[PDB]
């Protein structure tokens, strides 16, 4: 069985990926020893990059996620190495490799439990970096990004800084611009993210998010009232983040309904 899986891995590393993945998962030490080969391969590819290596990296990440899903100190090292190798390749900017990396990071983070002090700064900076250029992306990439944030938020408990959620519920943030897509899947995942964020446990970290939501609702209501020549009111929950913003009638109505 040690060498039997080698042929399957080699064949899968070249729309039939689902069949081989399912067969390998249902078929079942060796994984620990094989992890070094893949880690060295990706490290060498990234070092030599500084472009036809993208498909190879994507295939390696896919097989890595498949073998990991087929299944307590090397998890942090592996996550840090993966994040560093993924962030190093900041030239080609391929969505396939990034999507595979996001899925792998999400499954690895979800494998453990929220009872440690793993490095969260790298994960937070990685998520923010991806969100900074996750506006004009594909449908298969946006869903992966949203899922990654969902896993990160649920995994880290009582360790979310105020600045993390402060920059996530502001007009400049792209999160508020992702719920306007025509598909319903994006709206569903967005609602799930909102629910996860609102389902925290620390009052100080949730107060800022609640205030931001209230401010957005107040701004939308004020815009709607002004659109029909009516004086503004309900300023008791006004937020400084929306001192001067213009929202369309349909946009304001949709925002209020979503909130």
């Amino acid at each position: 069985f040690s060498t039997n899986f080698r042929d399957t891995v080699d064949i899968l590393v070249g729309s039939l990926t689902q069949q081989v993945s399912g067969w390998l998962q249902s078929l079942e030490a060796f994984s620990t020893t094989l992890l070094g080969q893949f880690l060295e391969d990706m490290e060498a590819y990234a070092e030599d990059l500084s472009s036809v290596s993208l498909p190879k990296l994507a295939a390696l990440l896919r097989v890595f996620s498949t073998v990991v899903r087929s299944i307590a100190y090397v998890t942090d090292v592996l996550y840090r190495v993966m994040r560093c190798v993924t962030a190093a390749n900041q030239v080609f900017f391929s969505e396939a490799v990034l999507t595979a990396a996001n899925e792998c990071v999400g499954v690895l983070l979800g494998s453990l439990d929220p009872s440690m002090t793993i490095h969260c700064d790298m994960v937070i900076t990685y998520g923010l970096d991806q969100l900074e250029n996750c506006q004009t992306c594909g449908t298969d990439y946006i869903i992966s990004v949203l899922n990654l944030l969902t896993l990160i938020v649920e995994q880290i408990n009582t360790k979310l800084p105020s600045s993390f959620v402060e920059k996530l519920f502001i007009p400049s943030s792209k999160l508020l611009f992702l719920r306007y897509h025509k598909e319903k899947e994006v709206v569903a995942v967005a609602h799930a993210v909102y629910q996860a964020v609102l389902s925290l446990k620390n009052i100080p970290v949730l107060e800022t998010a609640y205030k931001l939501i209230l401010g957005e609702m107040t701004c939308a209501l004020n815009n709607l009232l002004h659109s029909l020549q009516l004086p503004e009111a309900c300023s008791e929950i006004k937020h400084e983040a929306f001192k001067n913003h213009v929202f369309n009638v349909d946009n304001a109505k949709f925002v209020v309904i979503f909130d």
Binding site: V187, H191, V249, I257, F258
Partner: protein, 307 residues
């Protein structure tokens, strides 16, 4: 010694499919005056038969098989063919005459005429124009049904048809009914736009399309003030058969709207046709006379010679 003559159970064919008069409704007419005539205009799949059946002698609780006017069947929608052909006729117990109309500019007619004077398109257009003129000269109220909004083609057709009438002039009333409405069509913001575009599209129509059958006066919008609209035209909406927010279909019940429309149509004015009092039999004779006269007319030939 005062029993009624007879009660109509199903509609009859007033005009044959080959543009021929069918005098078979005399037995269902009396010597009474002050009669009401209703005409209907629309596209192929607007639903004229269903609305007429529901407004004459049917209710939504019934089935399409027992309707007075035969509607489209399941096997006919797939083929995309019309159902009602020619002109129908039916009189209710309240001495109200209902008249149906076949689709205008429908591709089914063209397809059936292909395997049968210059081009069939001109013939179809002339037939539609003639039926429109007939409906605009002997009908007290005409209802226009549109499956979708912003057609930009029916208004021009109506304007051209009103200018080719045979002949102290009289203009019949009009009603704008939007069949198969959605929630987006039940908003004041869109309602105002609809009213303004309708007013700007029929500035010189010379017809009575305002001042009667006000939607705001039907209690549909309890809190909408009448002054919010510059000019509330005679328009009505009909919804379909009876998502971050559950429920809230976005429109009132179909039965309530159809009942309100039926009552408003039944309580419509009945002005005189010509400078003489007309009765049921007299009205039928007048309709047949104008039909025969418009058939062998000169305006239609002159308009056809230009195409």
């Amino acid at each position: 010694k005062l029993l009624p003559p007879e009660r109509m159970k199903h509609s009859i064919k007033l005009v044959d499919d080959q543009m021929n008069w069918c005098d078979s409704a005399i037995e269902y007419l009396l010597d009474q005056t002050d009669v009401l005539v209703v005409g209907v205009l629309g596209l192929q799949g607007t639903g004229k038969s269903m609305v007429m059946s529901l407004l004459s002698a049917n209710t939504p609780e019934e089935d399409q098989r027992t309707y007075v006017f035969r509607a489209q069947s399941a096997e006919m929608k797939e083929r995309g063919g019309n159902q009602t052909s020619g002109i129908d006729f039916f009189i209710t117990q309240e001495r109200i005459v209902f008249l149906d109309t076949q689709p205008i500019l429908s591709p089914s007619i063209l397809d059936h005429l292909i395997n049968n004077y210059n081009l069939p398109h001109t013939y179809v257009e002339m037939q539609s124009l003639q039926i429109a003129a007939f409906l605009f000269t002997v009908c007290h109220v005409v209802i226009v049904v549109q499956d979708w909004f912003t057609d930009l083609s029916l208004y021009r057709f109506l304007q051209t048809a009103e200018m080719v009438k045979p002949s102290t002039e009289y203009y019949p009333h009009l009603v704008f009914l939007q069949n198969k409405a959605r929630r987006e069509d039940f908003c004041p913001r869109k309602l105002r736009q609809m009213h303004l575009m309708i007013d700007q599209l029929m500035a010189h129509s010379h017809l009575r399309y305002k001042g009667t059958l006000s939607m705001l006066q039907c209690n549909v919008f309890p809190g909408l003030p009448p002054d919010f609209l510059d000019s509330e035209v005679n328009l009505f909406l009909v919804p379909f058969m009876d998502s971050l927010l559950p429920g809230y279909r976005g429109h009132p019940s179909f039965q309530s709207l159809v009942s309100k429309l039926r009552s408003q149509v039944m309580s419509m004015a009945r002005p005189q046709l010509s400078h003489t009092i007309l009765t049921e039999k007299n009205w039928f004779h007048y309709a047949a006379r104008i039909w025969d006269g418009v058939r062998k007319s000169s305006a239609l030939a002159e308009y056809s010679r230009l195409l």
